[PDB]
């Protein structure tokens, strides 16, 4: 539903100013996939001159102390790795604060249950609702819409049976295992392809992004491999090389062992 | 012999890490202090080229005296009269060979090891460049020896007929160097439960003399070579390590 370039300009209209703490990002300290995804999210905010924070978060209780204490210049927020599974309006206790809300949250996740009260009901929590993880499933959608509406015994029991069957569908979702669909550090590169900054170093933070989940994780690495074997061929200096000059970093595919 | 100088002469001039290049700044600061040596880290050879280290690892006795004349053609591109032959000191860290297992396979191969030094000796003199005249012909010449393989590998010729070995060394025009003759004992934590601790004897060149006191823990990078003096068997040689580069610890 929300793509990237319309949401990228939504972060530059409210952050390019004189004060420093205009946006704040939060990083989980464990996912290596969440480490490369912020290392190339500083380079994107260094060439456009926006001032920021980079705060690491370990626990789940440490997110509550850091968030519920320091709220003066939140003209934006950002959150990488966390926020996929647990309902944020019900956990941070956020209420309506004035369309044209004072605070945006842009979660980035790599997990299975979408947690429908974050994606839908997006008053302030901007989703990540392109069909990558979403896959455009409709049975989740209408059951969420045919619930929030609150001879009369005949239809209301039929409504109660409709209450009874629809939560059965909501127990087919929200009853599932948490694994990884896409890596995070391939998703931000799809944002860097549209804006127009893809160096050679901003490619080296995806090969470290989507090799962390090859060895010890599920392998979607077999489906993310033909997309990175072409972005290496595209940015290549020449066919035949000079004989090993002390400059010229050259990354190139090679038969490598396990 | 030919053109392997130029494959090394480009290595000193053109080796360069990120911003400041080392072997034209280590060769210049060791002439102003009058130090006359150089220290090659051996990992930087094989990163620059593998064909050079392939020759050096196979037959080291004939190529290191070719690199010593490849330095003294570069120090005349910096100073511009007496510049002697430079000395090559190298160090690395691959894998220690323990002192007990030195087979007959490691003859003339770069070998590093470790141990405790027992004793030293008094200094001596070896000749590098000497001047010869014949007794009857009085035909002068000059033999310049630079290779080191202890007794005799290069000697006087037999004719410039004249008699058996008509040659005299003249002591008024020559150059000389030093030798040191250490001894080295293995570390007692590789315990010989039914054996005594063995030992070897090394040699040292002109710029490693008087560097180490008896009783330290050293690591020594050298050429495991052989010599055949009779100072007990038939066709028996004796082993010794020609040191080129002693990497001691902090002396403490």
């Amino acid at each position: 539903i929300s793509q990237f370039s319309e949401a990228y300009n939504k972060i530059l209209r409210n952050s390019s100013s004189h004060s420093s703490c205009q946006l704040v990002i939060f990083v989980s300290c464990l996912n290596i996939d969440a480490l490369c995804a912020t290392k190339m999210l500083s380079l994107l905010f260094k060439k456009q001159l926006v001032q920021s924070q980079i705060v690491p978060i370990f626990g789940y209780s440490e997110l509550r102390r850091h968030y519920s204490q320091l709220d003066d210049n939140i003209n934006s927020l950002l959150l990488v790795g966390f926020g996929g599974v647990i309902d944020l309006e019900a956990f941070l206790e956020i209420d309506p604060q004035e369309q044209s809300f004072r605070r945006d949250i842009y979660v980035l996740d790599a997990h299975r249950p979408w947690n429908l009260d974050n994606i839908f009901g997006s008053q302030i929590i901007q989703c990540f609702d392109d069909g990558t993880v979403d896959d455009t499933l409709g049975e989740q959608k209408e059951a969420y819409y045919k619930l929030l509406e609150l001879n009369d015994l005949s239809k209301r029991k039929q409504r109660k049976k409709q209450i009874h069957e629809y939560e059965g569908v909501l127990e087919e979702y929200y009853s599932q295992g948490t694994t990884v669909v896409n890596s995070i550090s391939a998703q931000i590169y799809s944002l860097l392809s549209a804006i127009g900054e893809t160096n050679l170093s901003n490619l080296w933070l995806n090969i470290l992004g989507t090799t962390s989940l090859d060895i010890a994780y599920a392998q979607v690495y077999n489906r993310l491999y033909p997309l990175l074997q072409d972005e290496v061929k595209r940015l290549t200096p020449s066919s035949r090389n000079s004989v090993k000059t002390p400059d010229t970093l050259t990354l190139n595919i090679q038969p490598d062992y396990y | 012999n030919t053109e392997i100088i130029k494959s090394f002469k480009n290595f000193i001039l053109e080796f360069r890490l990120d911003s400041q290049f080392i072997y034209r700044d280590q060769l210049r600061n060791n002439i102003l202090v009058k130090n006359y040596s150089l220290t090659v880290n051996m990992e930087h050879l094989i990163g620059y080229n593998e064909d050079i280290y392939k020759k050096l690892s196979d037959e080291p006795s004939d190529i290191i005296p070719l690199f010593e004349t490849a330095i003294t053609q570069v120090a005349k591109r910096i100073s511009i009269n007496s510049l002697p032959t430079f000395q090559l000191i190298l160090n690395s860290n691959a894998n220690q060979i323990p002192l007990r297992d030195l087979d007959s396979e490691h003859v003339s191969k770069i070998v590093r090891l470790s141990g405790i030094i027992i004793s030293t000796s008094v200094l001596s003199s070896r000749a590098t460049y000497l001047s010869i005249m014949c007794r009857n012909c009085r035909h002068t010449t000059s033999i310049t020896i630079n290779n080191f393989n202890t007794g005799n590998t290069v000697s006087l010729p037999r004719s410039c007929n004249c008699g058996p070995d008509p040659y005299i060394i003249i002591h008024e025009s020559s150059k000389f160097i030093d030798q040191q003759f250490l001894k080295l004992q293995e570390i007692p934590e590789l315990v010989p439960v039914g054996e005594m601790p063995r030992n070897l004897t090394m040699t040292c060149d002109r710029y490693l003399t008087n560097k180490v006191i008896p009783g330290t823990r050293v690591t020594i990078v050298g050429i495991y070579s052989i010599y055949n003096s009779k100072n007990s068997g038939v066709a028996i040689r004796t082993p010794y390590i020609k040191i080129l580069g002693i990497q001691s610890d902090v002396e403490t």
Side-chain angles (χ1 to χ4, degrees), chain B residues 1-249 251-252:
Chain B
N1 40 1
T2 53
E3 78 91 22
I4 211 75
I5 292 169
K6 282 186 191 176
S7 174
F8 186 78
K9 203 173 188 176
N10 290 338
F11 165 68
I12 275 173
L13 302 180
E14 306 291 13
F15 187 76
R16 179 172 295 120
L17 35 70
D18 76 355
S19 193
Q20 153 52 43
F21 59 73
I22 330 163
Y23 297 149
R24 284 174 64 187
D25 280 19
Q26 208 186 307
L27 199 146
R28 193 185 80 102
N29 307 1
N30 290 4
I31 290 179
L32 309 185
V33 190
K34 282 172 68 175
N35 215 7
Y36 287 94
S37 89
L38 204 151
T39 307
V40 164
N41 215 29
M42 218 207 289
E43 300 103 8
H44 299 151
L45 265 160
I46 70 169
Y48 168 70
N49 188 16
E50 203 191 11
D51 273 343
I52 293 171
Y53 185 70
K54 208 260 166 175
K55 291 194 176 184
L56 205 78
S57 74
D58 182 26
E59 200 178 15
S61 68
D62 301 351
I63 303 176
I64 311 187
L66 254 174
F67 283 177
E68 273 175 70
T69 82
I71 288 175
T72 69
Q73 293 182 345
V74 181
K76 301 170 191 177
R77 282 194 194 168
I78 289 179
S79 88
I80 309 302
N81 306 299
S82 159
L83 294 171
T85 58
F86 270 85
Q87 195 217 354
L88 198 64
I89 288 174
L90 47 87
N91 74 316
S92 50
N93 48 6
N95 267 320
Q96 305 190 4
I97 301 183
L99 201 40
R100 302 286 273 273
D101 45 346
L102 291 171
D103 271 29
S104 157
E105 57 184 0
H106 310 311
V107 160
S108 62
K109 280 202 171 194
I110 283 94
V111 160
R112 96 172 57 65
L113 47 95
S114 314
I116 302 177
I117 286 157
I118 294 181
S119 92
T120 78
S121 173
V122 193
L123 315 182
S124 314
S125 316
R126 178 71 69 192
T128 73
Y129 161 64
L130 47 87
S131 296
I132 315 178
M133 282 194 84
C134 171
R135 47 186 70 185
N136 299 312
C137 319
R138 295 184 183 179
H139 170 74
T140 176
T141 186
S142 67
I143 282 190
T144 83
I145 68 180
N146 41 38
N147 187 3
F148 298 95
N149 300 338
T150 307
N152 164 40
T153 174
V154 177
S155 175
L156 312 172
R158 299 170 182 268
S159 195
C160 67
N161 311 328
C162 291
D165 306 328
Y167 274 150
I168 311 175
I169 308 161
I170 282 180
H171 280 318
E172 315 165 359
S173 310
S174 312
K175 297 185 198 175
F176 286 87
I177 53 159
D178 312 329
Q179 280 185 348
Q180 181 67 271
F181 281 136
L182 274 76
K183 275 190 180 179
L184 173 61
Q185 187 185 6
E186 55 257 23
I187 288 188
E189 281 49 49
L190 290 179
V191 53
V193 296
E195 206 198 313
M196 285 299 293
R198 319 168 167 185
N199 43 3
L200 288 186
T201 82
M202 288 84 71
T203 70
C204 309
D205 206 322
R206 59 217 98 182
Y207 268 107
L208 304 159
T209 56
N210 284 156
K211 199 175 290 294
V212 58
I213 313 162
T216 69
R217 297 291 182 103
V218 302
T219 78
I220 289 177
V221 178
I223 291 178
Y224 183 94
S225 162
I226 218 164
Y227 86 108
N228 50 8
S229 89
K230 320 217 173 189
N231 296 320
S232 158
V234 48
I236 295 302
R237 260 68 173 156
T238 296
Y240 83 120
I241 303 181
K242 175 174 154 199
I243 284 185
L244 63 167
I246 170 169
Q247 192 45 269
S248 173
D249 43 356
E251 174 69 15
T252 71

Side-chain angles (χ1 to χ4, degrees), chain A residues 70-114:
Chain A
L70 310 185
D71 313 303
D72 45 355
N73 277 335
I74 307 180
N75 208 3
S76 155
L77 205 49
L78 189 61
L79 192 146
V80 175
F82 270 97
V85 192
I86 311 107
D87 280 303
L88 312 169
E89 278 196 1
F91 176 59
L92 311 179
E93 294 173 356
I94 321 180
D95 299 331
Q97 296 171 354
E98 312 171 9
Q99 308 155 1
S100 157
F101 295 99
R102 322 159 40 214
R103 168 168 321 131
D104 296 351
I105 297 168
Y106 309 92
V107 297
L108 281 191
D109 47 14
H111 288 79
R112 292 290 295 237
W114 324 269

Side-chain angles (χ1 to χ4, degrees), chain A residues 20-45:
Chain A
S20 68
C21 207
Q22 281 296 321
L23 82 160
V24 176
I25 86 172
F26 290 141
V27 193
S28 79
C29 314
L30 275 308
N31 281 321
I32 309 99
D33 212 31
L35 171 57
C36 319
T38 74
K39 182 54 190 182
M40 73 184 189
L41 211 50
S42 72
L43 298 177
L44 178 58
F45 288 143

